[PDB]
Design a protein around this ligand. Sequence first.
Ligand SMILES: [Ca+2]
Ligand SMILES: [Mn+2]
Ligand SMILES: [Mn+2]
Ligand SMILES: [Mn+2]
Ligand SMILES: [Mn+2]
Length: 344
Amino acid sequence: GIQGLLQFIKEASEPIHVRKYKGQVVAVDTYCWLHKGAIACAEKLAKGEPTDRYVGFCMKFVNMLLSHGIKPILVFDGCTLPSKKEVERSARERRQANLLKGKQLLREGKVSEARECFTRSINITHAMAHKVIKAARSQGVDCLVAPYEADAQLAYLNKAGIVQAIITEDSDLLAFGCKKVILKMDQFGNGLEIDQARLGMCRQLGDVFTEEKFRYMCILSGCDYLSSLRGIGLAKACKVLRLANNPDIVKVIKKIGHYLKMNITVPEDYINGFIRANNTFLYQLVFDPIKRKLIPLNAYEDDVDPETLSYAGQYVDDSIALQIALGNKDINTFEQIDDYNPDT
DNA sequence: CGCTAGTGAC
DNA sequence: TCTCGTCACTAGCG
Ligand SMILES: [Ca+2]
Ligand SMILES: [Mn+2]
Ligand SMILES: [Mn+2]
Ligand SMILES: [Mn+2]
Ligand SMILES: [Mn+2]
């Protein structure tokens, strides 16, 4: 998520209701509803007890969307990006640490305070996601597991004209160049739509309303793919790009301290990190549901060597990616767990 | 004065 | 998804 991007571009925000997209197709970032659902039953989950509160929690929103004549497409995360591997394992070890410190020191030492480190160690496994997938398919709702980060898949679905809007709580979707994003949506169906075309309504934004410059801004302000520089946020980065006239972004990144009148020394690794972050936002591997193949988010431009974009995802055979997308193949063990076929 | 980053609570 | 988010504070930079 981008730090307070929603508040920054408020002028481009529009309070709507889901009824706006009646008789239309909308993709859904199911991970948000999954995470929000894994709270009211977090205890029973971490104890090792079969609970399905999060399932009904997601199906609440699903049936809510169905009640307004909308066709939802639930999208899930798949293989972890090669760049976010170490972060994943780190957060994993942190959750293991909380789980370890919340089993003996809080169950015998401070019994009255056990659900402290017992609720801060939650992980959305593929098993839970699949448990949601079954219940969703049982209602005739289409499901699609992304080959990697669901963000890029949703972005594709929106940019390909397959879906009209993207329902999420993650601010990263805006940086991917989505045309329609519905945030902060409650159980009743009231959310905030951000149309890309209306990005020009933001006076504070300046001439940073183009997809490329907006992307550069989101990356420079800090994101999952790259951490922000010290004393750098949305305003200062936006100012950097707004006061920039150079076609080449690299030189601007080098002169960032010169544009902001700040004593900032640019790290050599930060440049490459920026290049990789941008190439990840641009050419992250997604799954085409129509042509049934594994393609990047956008078409490769002239200034990019596709054989160097390993961090943005690695290619697999179309049949394998097809079995991943359907949810039939386990992400970890790479074996078939289901025999679901969309043509039968 | 504004921005950034870090703290405190639901 | 660096509580998950929200906002007031606020310290501290420039
Ligand atoms: Ca300019
Ligand atoms: Mn993120
Ligand atoms: Mn894979
Ligand atoms: Mn995501
Ligand atoms: Mn994201």
